[PDB]
Each structure stands twice: as structure tokens, then as C-alpha cells.
Amino acid sequence: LRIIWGTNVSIQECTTNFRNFLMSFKYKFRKILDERDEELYYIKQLNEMRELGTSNLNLDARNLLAYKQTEDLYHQLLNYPQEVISIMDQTIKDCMVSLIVDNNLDYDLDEIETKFYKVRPYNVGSCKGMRELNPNDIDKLINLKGLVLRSTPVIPDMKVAFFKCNVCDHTMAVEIDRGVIQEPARCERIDCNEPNSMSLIHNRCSFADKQVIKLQETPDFVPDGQTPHSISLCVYDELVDSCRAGDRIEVTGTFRSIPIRANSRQRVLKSLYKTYVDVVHVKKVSDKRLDVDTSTIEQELMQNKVDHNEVEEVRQITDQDLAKIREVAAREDLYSLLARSIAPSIYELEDVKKGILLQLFGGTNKTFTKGGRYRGDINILLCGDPSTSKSQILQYVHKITPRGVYTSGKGSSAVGLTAYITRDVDTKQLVLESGALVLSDGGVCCIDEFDKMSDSTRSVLHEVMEQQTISIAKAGIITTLNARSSILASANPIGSRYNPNLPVTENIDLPPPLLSRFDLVYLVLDKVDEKNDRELAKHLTNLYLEDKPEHISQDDVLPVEFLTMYISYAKEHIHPIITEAAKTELVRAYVGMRKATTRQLESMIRLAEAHAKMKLKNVVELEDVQEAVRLIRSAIKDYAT
Amino acid sequence: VDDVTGEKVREAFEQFLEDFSVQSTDTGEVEKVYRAQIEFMKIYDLNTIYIDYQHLSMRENGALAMAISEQYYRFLPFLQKGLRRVVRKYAPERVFQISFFNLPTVHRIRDIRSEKIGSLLSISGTVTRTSEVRPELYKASFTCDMCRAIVDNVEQSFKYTEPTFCPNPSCENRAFWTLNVTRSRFLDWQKVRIQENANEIPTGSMPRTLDVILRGDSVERAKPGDRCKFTGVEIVVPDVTQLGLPGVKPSSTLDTRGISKTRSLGVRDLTYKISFLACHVISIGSDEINELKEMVKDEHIYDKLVRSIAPAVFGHEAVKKGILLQMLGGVHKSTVEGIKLRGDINICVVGDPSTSKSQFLKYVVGFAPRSVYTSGKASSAAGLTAAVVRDEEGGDYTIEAGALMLADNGICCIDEFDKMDISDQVAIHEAMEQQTISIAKAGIHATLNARTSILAAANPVGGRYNRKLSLRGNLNMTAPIMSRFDLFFVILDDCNEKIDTELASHIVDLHMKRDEAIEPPFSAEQLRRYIKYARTFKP
Amino acid sequence: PPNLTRRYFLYFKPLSQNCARRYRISSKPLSVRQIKGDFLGQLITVRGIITRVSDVKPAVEVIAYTCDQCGYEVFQEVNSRTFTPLSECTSEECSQNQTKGQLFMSTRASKFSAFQECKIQELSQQVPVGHIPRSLNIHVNGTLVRSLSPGDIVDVTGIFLPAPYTGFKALKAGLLTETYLEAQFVRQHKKKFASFSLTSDVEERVMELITSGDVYNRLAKSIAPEIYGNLDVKKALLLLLVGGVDKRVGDGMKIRGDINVCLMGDPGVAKSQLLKAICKISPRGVYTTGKGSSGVGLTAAVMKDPVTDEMI
Ligand SMILES: Nc1ncnc2c1ncn2[C@@H]1O[C@H](COP(=O)(O)OP(=O)(O)O)[C@@H](O)[C@H]1O
Ligand SMILES: [Zn+2]
Ligand SMILES: [Zn+2]
Ligand SMILES: [Zn+2]
């Protein structure tokens, strides 16, 4: 019997059990968990990983929950994550060498023995924010889900406590013991005996890498009277430059505790221990929404490649799903099926939904040698009678988009939009905080009640809507940053109940140019009549008829997952270059519609590029101009007046 | 371990320096000139030698440098000792400096980790402040507290507190010491603040910054508000600002095991930041005579210049001419009383939105030697002008590099002119009435000098500019600031299909990646030198 | 000590005077001002309203110090706000040992218990004439930390105990003490919606309520009978209270089962009796004026917490 004091964990028994489970796991969860070809789920990763020289590996929890001989390992890695993982770091190499026994290989053995190994349990049991963590359940594997606010600099830590003897031309070496250094005051008595003659040098020693990340907690349930909170944590080396502001995150780690000094003067501490979290893994993507622009993050991609840390940054594809995508693109009913699928719970609003999907496509991202940049984003505005699904659509877009923020009415100011300067509550130093305009850098920006919002705030957007670059000049901060976010907002009519017989360009309580520069606008007038109302009424009542709208899937509605993966692949893989035929229709359509400024030309070209991106065309074609102009005219409803 | 390796490295490096000489024969085989380099250095007694990485790394297959770079400090004393030995060998009151420039690799501030400690590493960034020259403690004498015995040694980098050995060891307490000021050596010092560069920033990101320090004669090569390419070693310094943070904190303590019967523990807390040092820095960011001679001979080159300053923009020749003449300043020395003029000039434009006013801004800021793009609204006078520090970090204050304070002999392009506050327009009026500024806070007074030529963008009250009314009723800004302006421009559109078709043609053609539609007479490369030559012609 | 062997906290609750009357008191509902000074530590029951309570956090009660060489533990006990760590080896084996190998602490063996503070503010009707009320502080630990939420009627119970503070070192005469109270049990006349479990009698109450019939209009009638008529408006208020039904789309959206009402009309007729009765009866209620502190009083605020550095 071998055991750890105050513990029920065995080293060799756990090693044997781990090896047995590793050798025996073939989609056991597809059989036990549910009803859902392949073989040896786990073993492929370990077979492939050897030749690429990587000291990392991921790991699930459902697999241990499924396999017969890992249920007890479940609670033991739960309660004692660090100890169980230190065991696994040896068990993995044991299995590696016991699996090479059945193979003859070129002499690569110089590396594996000197190597190290580590794991990353990522998909684990759910946790209910931090309110659940009363002190009974400290120091345990945990999970969470929140966004990023603030990032700190690098904290070095004493890892090799070098030491310089003052005489006898001798150095000295000593290492850390549970996070402290005990300088040997002596001077190597044999050669010289000076009980307290030694020095310290920093350049010699080795240092660790640590960061601290301020995070905003976003739970799924909250009590009666809850409010947002902030937490601090700590990541360590090989994970630097991974998470930052503007990313939603599902994370894993270990809740912990620590006291703090009462001053920089003596050792007297607080009866209350400041809490924190130490990271184990970070999940940077999820299934219910697409991912970041790939061309926007090339530098970080290459940096991570060089650093040999390859946590997920973009979703991966399958050839069978690629073929399925090409098959689905063959049929011609895409152009309406996408609209029917974006929001099955709402009446048609066909052009509105079509424009939303084209915006999600985005469009073109070109650049010049040094003096140009043209990003894929077309500002959108809504307007019309209230009591419709405008707010519902906006909230849906905010949910489904990964990188965006919601702003409402006059509750906002220029200071709280662009960069603003504040102070930390612990370090008591001048630290900054990112603004909502920049937080959505690439994605969606949602506004509602665009009319009552203050003029001071309404001033800033003039340059955002053009060059996507905010500028800042205040205390100790002079830099121009990037705000590639997109704009998608609603507007309210002048007065109330609208005015049919009046020019709508003057019936909004909003100046001409601010409305004209919008790439496209949509109108939600009422036009009450049957054949458009009874159908809507049933459409919405059948939603409630069921406990949850799953019968809504009828009438040719796609699932979210394949739709999103198709969108992501199309966004990341194709680049339609402008063509020649579209010119003679685009120019004429623009000139004829002028009878109201040149910005609609940019709107039309950027939307036709998104249309070409749809259908997976690598080239524009004349037809997109036709759809763009026709939809613009229908959106403004030219026929009425 | 390097008690053996270091001297071998010294010998190998001095042999490297000696075996090479000045061959450079007919621009052929390049032999390293370090001998004559140190000779020419001894000509003026400067002792600030330079070294190039490529030549050093050529010989010995570069494994030498491979190990030296990561273990730089462990051998640096021996490197300087070998340099001294070579000086003794081949040349006839001695403090030296060294540097390594033209490194192959570049690391941003985010590309620095804890495995580059004491290792040479090239960085590039930006400057936002400087500091005060304060002579630093190179060597310093001490004396015994019971006699005149002087010790002319020094503990230099850190641990600058106490020597031990006394020439006459008969002393009740030889542990502590006295000090002295004159029998000592000193060398210059300077501090700056380094900053991120815009063209390499991530999303949701602030310009993460840190502090770097200089030494020796290489000082005076720093500059506020400029991009620079530093090179040095990963020095680190203590700090306590990192308190109150999670995790366990390392702490030092002398041992009390093995020897016994001898806060009593003398526990010292350790927690360090990662600053940087610089051995050398450079400012980042001929047949030209024949080129410019050929250019000048033409007559319509005026029109060529006018039309070449904004190919990315269409028409509006007035804006082109105004921007071309803005960079040129007028002679401000034309007085006899000593009361002076605002030699340079000012510009401003008007026009409804859906116009290309901002294109001119972005062009000029992306081409100007000195310039800055700011908000115009989201900015305080403290941001435009300089808000200074009040006796922080022990030393004295220092004048911050003001944003508007910048643009010395340059431009300060500012957008969104309508929404400016009251105080900021008051400050701009003060800065414009004279070519001087005055500041004060916490009792301190300041006096600056600058000749700024402002180009800004107007925004009428309602956006619509009533053609039948006067300028004042629509401009909405007080008479003094409205005045002092040499030029006013108006840019409003009208229905003209023949030209609008071609305008849309250009706009859509711009959506052809790096097309040839912007074919100018010539490029910024030679335009900048033309501007530099023309800035001082004195008509 | 025996403290670390304790697997059970304790939290008293005082008697209800209804039974103290049976056979024949000590603690009645009191005020933030009627302490009288002499009540330091006695059994008390104070009412009021909770304004701000910090988030729960751990606090040590017993230290776990293990010896590197002796391999034996040590129990350092702390009951004040601060202490000083035990570094040098005073171990029992080290006592009979020249060497004194250093010791350290544990992160799991050492005991812990939560610590959370709350503030009461006096109820309105019991304030004397033209008198501005004042505040008070309490301390909480362990289990009952979750039974407090701001804005509710409360009857706190415990004991009023002192603490080491003497003004701030200039306006002092010695022996001065800042004070606090102990939290041991919470009862509130307002039962939130989350406390609903049926029993052997409340179902009987519902049964006898529904037996009478005409329940809907009877509710509409019993809604604030101090005013006259407008059964339609009282019914509309009843349906506002009900709220509706919650439905989830499941496609990344839900919809509110919520109601919004207005009572536009000229003055003279009753207008505010409705709102006052609604705030009186409904839980989680709120009342506001029209103008005044509407700039940020209806919006999020920024503040540093007293008992711990944080931007709550
Ligand atoms: N139907 C009614 N029965 C009894 N009293 C009434 C009635 N209507 C109004 N009142 C009295 O008239 C006053 C009117 O005030 P109220 O309607 O509450 O606010 P407001 O002054 O804004 O209308 C109340 O104080 C109330 O006592
Ligand atoms: Zn020695
Ligand atoms: Zn002496
Ligand atoms: Zn001991």
C-alpha cells in the first residue's frame, strides 16, 4: 500500500488505472451517455503528437465519467487537481515509453527523457459563479464563464536563487522551498569560514512568468438582487498573451486563498484572506457563435506558433462537412433559407434578416502598401413604428455575435465610450480601462433609442463611421487606436404614430447627413391588413402553444451549428475580387438613385461583396448589383412617395 | 563554473579583435576594423566603442555568440577586461562603454519573457517623457569610523551599502563604515519612459509601457514623442507596487541551521519588475541631387506637386494647395523692436458630412514628419497642453511632453472643431495669440515656445450651410478664434451627373487591391527630402 | 486546541415573545438609537433596513503550522483582526535540540470560517420628532451569511459587542471603543417568492381561500380598499403583480413574462394610494420621486467597500 498523508490517492495504482483507461476508451460516452464508425478515441492524439515535439495535452471529464474504471479517478482529480496531475505527468511518460516498446524508431530518444508533460482538464462539471464558493470547497478544479476587462504586466519570480560568495572565487546555488529562499549565510567553511559573508545578484538567477487578469463574471442564474462583480486570477508561463479584452471566455482553474500585508514595513497580516483563482486551462471559442477575423490576428497567430503554445484560436473543419457545405451551396434556395433560418420565431421581415446576414458576412478587407485600409463593415440603421421585433432582433444579434457591447439611450458619454483613466483598488496606481467602442473591435456594436442620446456622445461617431480609428489626448495617454467594430442600431420616428404624407428624410428628428451616411436603412411601417397579420398571429401563438419552440423547425429551418460553421469557413477562406461586368450596373444604379450621397456607393459595393462571399464565389458578378439596388429601393420603399 | 570559461572567452574575443584589421581593400574582403576603431576612439578619449553582431558571429560558426547572448552578464566583466588588455597591448583615468547594434531579431514588449534575463535583446517602441541628468555613483571612497584609512573601492550595480575589509583589522566593530564624496568617480545618468507603437498593437489594448535607463556618453540621444529602436540587457529593479496580488510571495532570510546560538530574522521581501537598459539606441521612423535637379527644371511641377499630395482623394485643388503651403513657414525674424510674429500659417475647412475632409487629415498625419491626430472633443486642455508631475519618485518634477506642445516646426491636425469645449478653445486662443504658452499648477510656473500651424475640420451648426447667410451665423465660435486664420475653405456638393459618374468610378476602382489608379508624378520618398530642402529657402 | 476538531457551527435564535407570555420579555424590537450603552453583549433583537452588505470571504480561526524536521504540528490561535506569523522553530522536539529547523503553514489543515458585515438603518415611524436617524454595524460568519439581502424588513438577533478603536489618536481620552454586533438568526415579515414549500396547513389556507369563490374579483376588491372603486385598475395591478409566463426560444433568446401599466389621468382622484399600497404589500418593492436624484439614483453606482478593498 502506498498513500499520501491525509489523502486517499495511490501513485502506482492510479498509474495502472490511467494506462488501462487510455488503452481502453472508444467513444464510450456516445454509448453510455446517449444513443449516438471510429475506434480508440484517445489513442490517436498520443500516436500523432510524438513527432511534433509538444509537451501539452488536453483532457475531458465526460470520458472519465463514461469509462468503467475512472469514476473514482473523477473525484480524486477533482479534490486534488495538482497532485493528481503531478502523478499524471509521470504516468503519461510511462505509457509513452511502454507504447514505444511495440515500435522501432529512428534515434529521437534524446528528447523524450529530458522532456516534461502536463495536462489541461477543460470540459468539466459546471459551477455557479463564485457565490457557491464558501470556504468548504476551496482549492478544487473549477469552471466559469466571463469576459475580460483589464490585463497586467509580467511578474517575475525567484526560480534559481543564485548567490555570490565575496571571496575564494566561488559562486553558490540554491533553489526555492515552498515559495521562499533561505540564503546560506555561511561561506563554504572548508575554503573559508565567514558565517554571514555572501551577496545576491539578480542578473544570474532564473525568473518565472506570471500575469493577472481582471475578469467580469457572467453566470446563468442569479439570486434576487444580484449585480456584476470583478475577480482577479493568475496565469503562468506558456500561457502569456492568450486572453485579453474583447473576448468572451469559458475557463477552468482552481479557487484559492491568500493573505496580504498590512504595509510595506513589517509582517502583520489580515484576519481575512483575499481570494483569487489559479488557472488550469482557457477555452477561447464555443459552438453557439462564430469566431474572430483570421486576417486581423495574424501577428498573434505567428507569435503563438513561435512560442509553441497552441491553445485553440480558430475552429477546425472536417472534409465530410466541407463536402456537405458544397452540396448545400448547390441548391438555389439558399438566398431565402438563410433568412428563414436566422429567426424562425419572427414574421418574415425578409429584407431586414437578409441584410443582417449580409452584415454578419461582413464583406471585404483590403489594404494598401502603406497608406490604405478598407474594412468589412457597413453601418445599419432601423426605423419605423414601435411594437415590433426590432429590439428582439438586436438582442439576438448581440447574443450571437462574439465581440460586441450593448448601449442604450442617453445613458452614455464620450468619456465612457473612448478611453478613460481610473485607479486600481489594490495596487493603488494609475491604471487604464478599455472603452466600449474599442471592446467590440471586430464584430457588432448595438444601440437603441438613437435619437434621445446626448449630442456630446453623438459627436464621436463621425470618425468611427469613416476610418474606424478613435483618438485620445488626455492625462498621460497619447495614442490612436483601432475600432474595427461594426455599427447596427435602431432609431425612433419624429413625434409619434408616424406621418404618412411627409418626406421621411425630414420626419425623424435627426439631421440629414447623419442619416444619409448610414450604408443602409430599413423601414418598419405598419400597413395593417389581413394576409399579413393573421399569419403572424398564428406564427407567434404556436410559439407559446409548446413548452418550447421545437415544432418551429418545420418549414425548412436549418440548425444553428452547420449554419455558423458554414459562415465561419466562408468568412475565413474566400476573397472575392471585384469584377468588370458589375461596373455598368452599379454606376447607373447609383446615378439613377441619386434623384442621396456618395456613401451609398460604398454601401452597395460592400454589400455586393458580401453577397458574392455568399454562394462561396471567389468573384463578384453582375447579379449582386441587381439584388443590392433592388433591396436598397425596397428597404426605403421608393414606390410610396 | 565560468571561472574557467570567462577567461577563455576573453582570450577568444580579444584574438578575434586582433586577428582582424582594416582590410576593406577596393570594397572587397571585409576585415573587421576594431583595431583602428579603438585607435580613432583613443584619438579623442571617448571610450564608447561600438560592435556589430554579424561580424562577431561569423567566426567560430556563431556558437560563441549563441551562448554569450543568453549568458551575457556572466562574461561581461571579462569582455571589458579583454578590451582593456588589447588597449594595453596596442596603445599607450579609464572608464569604458560598449554597445551592440544591428541585431537581427526584434521583440515587442509583449514578446519578452523571463528566459531573457541578463541577455542582450533588441526592442523598439516610443517615447513619452524624459527625466533629469543626475550624476550617478560609479566609484566612491569610504573611511574607517575610527581612523583615516580610506578605501577607494565600490560596490556598483546594487548592494551599494557596505564594504567590510579594513586595512588595519584591529577594530571593535568593523562591520559598518563611513563615506566620502570627493575621492570618487561619476558618470552621466538619464531616465525616459518607453511606449508601445501604434502599428503593432492588439485589439482591446492600451499602449503597455515600462521604464528604461541610460548610462555613459550615449545619453542625450533620447527624445520625447518619437519611435526608437533600443538595444540592451534585461536589467531588473526592486519594487513594492506589486503587493496585494494573489499567490504566494517569495521572501529572503539568512540561514540559522548548522550554526546556532548566534524582527530578529532579518527577513527582506523581494518582488521585482522588469525594466530595461540600453547600450545603444537609434531614432526609427547621393544622386538625389541629380533627381531634384531634373525635377526642378520643369515649370508645371507646381501643379504636379499640388495634384500629387492627395491621389487617394479626388479634386478639391484648393485643399491640395493649402496643405502644400501649410508646411512652409514664414520668416518670423522680420522686426527691429524684438516684438515678433507668428511666422507660419493656419488653415481650416468647412463642408457637410459625406465629404472627404477626413481623408486629407489621414493623408497628412500619415505623411508628416511631425504631427498628431487627436479627437478634438474627447480631450482636455491637460491633454493638449502639458500636465506635469508633482515631486514623484523622490526626485524633482519634469515638464511632460504636451500633445499640442508637439508640432514644433510641424502641424497639429485636429478633427471635430465644432464640439470643442470653452476651456480648450481658450487655451488654443492663448497658444495662437502669441507663439508662446504659459502653464502653472501647485505653484510651479512654466514657459514654452512653439510655432504651430493648425489645420482643423469645421462642422457647421446644423450641417447645412445656408448659402444666403453669412459665415458667423453658421460657424458658431467666438470672434478671436475665428480670426487669426489666414484661410477659410468651403466644400459643398451639387448635382452634376457627368462628374459624379466618374467620381463613383474612382471610388469603386479604389476597391481593387493596390491598383494603379493613384499613379502620381512621384512618391513620399523624394517628396519628404524636397520639403526638407524647401523649408529653408528665404525668399 | 479543540477548535479545529469542530465540524459544526452554532447559530442561536431568541424566543418569540408569544410563548414567553405563556407561563411568563427580555428582547423586544429596538432601534439604532435606543441602545442605552449598558446593553453591550446582552440578548437583543434590533429591526431596521439593510443598506449595503459586502461579499462573503474567508477568515482564519486556527493556524496549521507543520515542522520541517520535527514533523509535528503547532496551533497558533488568532482572534483579533491581525497577528504576527510564527517563524522560528519553538517545536517541542526542537526544544531539546541544538538545531531549530524552520516551520511553515498549511492551506487545508488550518481552520477557516466566513466573515461578512452588514449595516442597519432605523425604521421611519420610530424616529423622534425632527431627528435624523443614525447607523450601526454587524458582523456575520459561516452559515447564515446567505440569509440577508438589502431593502427588506428584518429582525436581527444576537449580542452587541465592542472592538479595538479609540477615535483617531487626537480626539481621545482613552478606553474608547468602536463597536459591532453578532448575527445569529434572521426572521423577516416579508417572505420572498423563493420560500414557498407547502406544509400541512398553508394548503388548507389556500383551500379555504378558493372555496369562497369569486376569487379574482375578490382579490381586485381587497387590493387597497382604502380608496373607492376602480376595480378594473385594481385588477390591472393584480395582473401586474402576477407578471405573466416565462418562455424560452432556445435559439439564443427568451421573452419576458412581465407586465407594464400606467394610470394616466387628471388630479383630484386618488393616484398615490395605489403605489403606496403596492410597495407595502408586494415584496422587493421600491418608490421614487419624479425629479431630484434621478441622475444616478436610478442607475449603477461606484464605491469602495469598507471591510475590504474592492470596487463594489
Ligand atoms: N376616491 C377617493 N377616496 C378617498 N380619498 C381620495 C379619493 N381620491 C383622492 N383622494 C384623496 O385626495 C388626495 C389626492 O392625492 P393623490 O391622488 O394620492 O396624488 P395626486 O395629488 O398626485 O393626485 C389623496 O391624499 C387622497 O386621500
Ligand atoms: Zn568565501
Ligand atoms: Zn578599522
Ligand atoms: Zn521543530
Amino acid at A135: P
Burial class of residue A3, CB neighbours in 10 A (0-12, 13-18, 19+): exposed
Contact between B489 and B348 (Cβ < 8 Å): yes
Q: What CATH number does the domain located at B286-539 have? A: 3.40.50.300
The Cβ of residue A239 has, within 10 Å, a number of other Cβ atoms equal to: 19
* C90-113 residues labelled b (16+ CB within 10 A) or e (exposed): ebeebeeeeebbbbbbeeeebbbb
Q: Which residues contact C260 (CB under 8 A, 6 or more apart)?
A: C240
* Cβ–Cβ under 8 Å, residues A194 and A167: yes
Method: cryo-EM
How many CB atoms lie under 10 A from the CB of residue A499?
13
Residue nearest to atom 10 of ligand 1 (CA): C270
* Residue carrying the nine cell digits 510674429: B341
Nearest CB neighbour to B203, from listed A441, A477, A512? A441
| Cβ–Cβ contact B74 with A under 8 A | yes
How far CA A325 is from CA of A563, A564, A636, B499, in Å, comes to 9, 11, 34, 45
Strand partners, B282: B229
Q: Which residue in the block uniquely carries the three cell numbers 511518460?
A: A93
Q: Which subunits count as partners of chain A given 3+ CB pairs below 8 Å?
A: B, C
How far apart CA A349 and CA A355 sit, in angstroms, is 10
DSSP string covering B351-410, please? Answer: E-SSSSHHHHHHHHHTT-SS---B-SSSB-HHHHTT----S-SSS-------TTT--TTS
A617: amino acid identity, one letter: K
DSSP label at B438? Answer: E
Q: How far is A155 from A603, CA to CA, in rounded Å?
A: 47
CA dist list (Å): B538 to A449, B289, B293, B531: 58, 20, 19, 14
Q: How far apart are the first and last CA of chain C?
A: 37
CATH number of B1-105: 3.30.1640.10
Nearest-neighbour CA in chain B from A158: distance (Å)? 7
How many C-beta atoms surround the C-beta of residue B490 within 10 A? 14
Cβ atoms of A439 and A419 within 8 Å: the answer is no
Q: Are B295 and B301 spatial neighbours (Cβ–Cβ below 8 Å)?
A: yes
Residues on chain C touching A134 (C-beta within 8 angstroms) = 56, 114, 145
Query: Residue type at A531?
Result: K
For residue A164, how far is its CA from the centre of ligand 3 (angstroms)? 24
**C144 to chain A: which residues are within 8 Å by CB?**
none
Query: How far is C27 from chain A, CA to nearest CA, in Å?
Result: 30
| Joined grid coordinates for residue B42 | 583613443
Q: Which three cell numbers stand for residue C124?
A: 421611519
Give me A575's grid cell.
476573397
Give residue A506's identity as a one-letter amino acid code.
E
Question: What's the rounded Cα separation, in Å, for the pair C83 and A259?
Answer: 12
Look at phi and psi of residue A498 and say left if phi exceeds 0, alpha if psi is from -120 to 50, else beta.
Answer: left
Contact A631, A355 (CB under 8 A): yes
Are A504 and A524 in contact, with CB atoms under 8 Å apart?
A: no
Q: How far is CA C193 from the centre of its chain?
A: 17
Task: Look at B464 and A512 and tell me if their CB atoms are within 8 Å.
Answer: yes
How far is Cα B425 from Cα B408, in angstroms, rounded to an integer? 20
Mind telling me how many Å the CA of A334 is from chain B's nearest CA? 27
Of C81, C84, C109, Cβ closest to residue A271: C81
Cell of A144: 466559469
Q: Does B112 reach chain A within 8 Å, measured CB to CB?
A: yes
Cell of B310: 492627395
Q: Are strands B251-254 and A181-183 parallel, antiparallel or unpaired?
A: parallel
Cα gap B158→B180, rounded to integer Å: 18
CA distance A213 to A234: 7
Task: Check if B147 contacts C (Cβ < 8 Å).
Answer: no
Name the residue with cell 509580467. Answer: A154
* Residues annotated within a binding site of C: 228, 268, 270-272
Decide: residue A591, CB within 10 A, 0-12 exposed, 13-18 middle, 19+ buried: middle
Grid cell at residue B337: 523692436
* Chains A & B: contacts with CB separation below 8 Å: 303
Within 13 Å, how many C-alpha atoms sit on residue C156's CB side? 31
Q: At B121, which helix (H) or strand (E)? A: strand B120-129
Please, are residues A213 and A235 in contact by the beta-carbon 8 Å criterion? yes
> Which residues of C sit within 8 Å Cβ distance of B?
87-88, 98-102, 309
Residue A204: helix, strand or coil by DSSP?
coil
Sign for the CA dihedral angle at A394, A397, A399, A404 comes to: negative
Return the beta strands (E) in C102-169 as ranges: 103-105, 112-114, 116-121, 135-140, 153-158, 160-163
Q: B106-134+188-239+271-285: which CATH architecture?
A: Beta Barrel (2.40)
The answer to whether A255 and A133 have CB atoms below 8 angstroms apart is yes
Would you list the DSSP string of A45-63? HHHHHGGGT-----B-SHH
Task: Write out chain C residues lying below 8 Å of B260, CB-based.
Answer: 98-100
Contact list, B373 vs chain A (CB under 8 Å):
469, 471, 480
**Which ligand 1 atom is nearest residue C229's CA?**
1
In Å, the largest CA–CA distance within chain A is 105
| Element housing A399 (H / E) | helix A390-400
Beta bridge partners of C118: C53, C138
Looking up cell 497658444 gives B431
Q: Which ligand is nearest to the CA of C74?
A: 4
- What is the separation of C-alpha C129 from the centre of its chain, rounded to a whole number of angstroms? 28
Beta-carbon contacts of A182 under 8 Å, excluding residues fewer than 6 positions away, are A174, B253, B254, B255, C102
- Of A540, A277, A215, A532, which Cα lies nearest the Cα of A392? A540
**Nearest beta carbon to residue A591 from set B158, B372, B501:** B501
Longest dimension (CA), chain C: 93
Asked if B257 and C99 come within 8 Å (Cβ–Cβ), the reply is yes
Domain borders along chain B are: 1-105, 106-134+188-239+271-285, 135-187, 286-539
Q: Give the separation between CA C193 and CA B232, rounded to whole angstroms.
A: 66
Nearest to C28 by CA among C12, C50, C44: C44
Residue B124 φ then ψ, to 5°: -135, 145
Helix (H) or strand (E) holding A304: helix A298-307
Q: Are A198 and A165 in contact (CB under 8 A)?
A: yes
